[PDB]
Design a protein around this ligand. Structure first.
Ligand SMILES: O=c1cc(N2CCOCC2)oc2c(-c3ccccc3)cccc12
Length: 127
């Protein structure tokens, strides 16, 4: 069994820009979720080899994690906030898809998503 290469965090062909929404997503949203007590499983890609989940990357074909998102925000990978918000939502949805409702990992993802939705609710207007 083998893990895939992690998601792209640098691509000079992909257009990108700094925006006030993207800065908020880094300084407020990512920062806040990262320090959550249940953040740790989501701070890097799922290691399906170490966790003995040989079917994980057969079920989850768009993996995402906050380590990747952090790198993307820090390296200004995105064109807009929606691209980043989609990465977060993919991360949560991956977890809800692969696991049964009420599992520990799902509860942890649901906690982060609650804080996520709190923070996106107060997403600033474009400057
Ligand atoms: O969807 C997932 C399913 C799992 N699993 C399956 C159930 O047993 C535990 C491992 O683990 C995940 C982890 C993770 C959990 C513990 C340690 C390291 C990573 C991080 C993010 C998503 C998942």
């Amino acid at each position: 069994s083998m893990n895939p290469p992690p998601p792209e965090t640098s691509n000079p062909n992909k257009p990108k820009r700094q925006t006030n929404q993207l800065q908020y997503l880094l300084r407020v949203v990512l920062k806040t979720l990262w320090k959550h007590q249940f953040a740790w499983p989501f701070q890097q890609p799922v290691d399906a080899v170490k966790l003995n989940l040989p079917d994980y990357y057969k079920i989850i074909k768009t993996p995402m994690d906050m380590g990747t998102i952090k790198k993307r925000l820090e390296n200004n990978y995105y064109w807009n906030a929606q691209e980043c918000i989609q990465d977060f939502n993919t991360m949560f949805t991956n977890c809800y898809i692969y696991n049964k409702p009420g599992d520990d990992i799902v509860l942890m993802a649901e906690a982060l998503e609650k804080l996520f939705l709190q923070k996106i609710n107060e997403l600033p207007t474009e400057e």
